[PDB]
Enzyme design. Structure first.
Site, PDB file in Angstrom:
ATOM      1  N   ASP A  11       0.804  -1.211   0.000  1.00 62.04           N
ATOM      2  CA  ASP A  11       0.000   0.000   0.000  1.00 62.04           C
ATOM      3  C   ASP A  11       0.840   1.265   0.000  1.00 62.04           C
ATOM      4  OD1 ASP A  11       0.957   0.153   2.649  1.00 62.04           O
ATOM      5  OD2 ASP A  11      -0.974  -0.448   3.496  1.00 62.04           O
ATOM      6  N   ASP A 121       0.623 -10.571   6.524  1.00 61.83           N
ATOM      7  CA  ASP A 121       0.334  -9.895   5.263  1.00 61.83           C
ATOM      8  C   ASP A 121       1.681  -9.655   4.579  1.00 61.83           C
ATOM      9  OD1 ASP A 121      -2.091  -7.209   4.503  1.00 61.83           O
ATOM     10  OD2 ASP A 121      -1.166  -8.718   3.242  1.00 61.83           O
TER      11      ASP A 121
END
Length: 212
Positions: A11, A121
């Site tokens: 991100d 993640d």
């Protein structure tokens, strides 16, 4: 220290372990300006909160052989806190999907969302920005679905150059594995990882040496 589920992400946000006072470390994870230059100033505001600090491109995974890779992840662990996982390293052995049996040693650079008992993640450029699109602010955005990121290896061809190796790793060594499961154990960090983030836990020696 257990079993867990993996997802994939990138991100571009300043990693949560890049902030001061979060864990007992020599210094927090190095973030980068929009042009991938390391920021020694840990007070720079995250590009995901209107600031100018981003994840360094060297927070990407890479393979050293067909059985072993190194990389980074956002962790959310049973019984743990940011103070116990920031800049810690963990050897994951995948237990499902096409990568079952392979080993990925990651350093935790951030706190991840809750998913299962021990969510990892895993950083890979083009894995998906999720809820915060910092990459839009950093350099105009990355292609790909919000969750899961790109679907074809050619889509890496238009990434910022520094993000292309980690983008292609996802399709090469990682075999485009879709959220594989794993077992994992905390280990002393290989210098391969702490040389990129500059962040090493004071308790690093309390855990076993990783043997490939």
């Amino acid at each position: 220290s257990g079993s867990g589920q993996s997802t994939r992400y990138w991100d571009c946000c300043k990693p949560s372990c890049s902030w001061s006072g979060k864990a007992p470390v020599n210094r927090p994870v190095l973030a980068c300006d929009a042009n991938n230059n390391p920021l020694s100033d840990a007070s720079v505001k995250s590009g995901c909160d209107g600031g100018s600090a981003y994840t360094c491109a060297n927070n990407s995974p890479w393979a050293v052989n067909d059985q072993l890779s190194y990389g980074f992840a956002a962790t959310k662990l049973s019984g743990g806190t940011e103070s116990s996982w920031c800049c810690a390293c963990y050897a994951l052995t995948f237990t499902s999907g096409p990568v079952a049996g392979k080993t990925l040693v990651v350093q935790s650079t951030s706190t991840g969302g809750d998913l299962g008992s021990n969510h990892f993640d895993i950083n890979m450029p083009g894995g998906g920005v999720g809820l915060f699109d910092g990459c839009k602010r950093q350099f105009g955005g990355l292609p790909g679905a919000q969750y899961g990121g790109i679907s074809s290896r050619s889509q890496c061809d238009s990434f910022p150059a520094a993000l292309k190796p980690g983008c292609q790793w996802r399709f090469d060594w990682f075999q485009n594995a879709d959220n594989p499961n794993f077992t994992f154990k905390q280990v002393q960090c290989p210098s391969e990882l702490t040389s990129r983030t500059g962040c090493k836990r004071n308790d690093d020696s309390q855990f076993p040496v990783f043997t490939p």
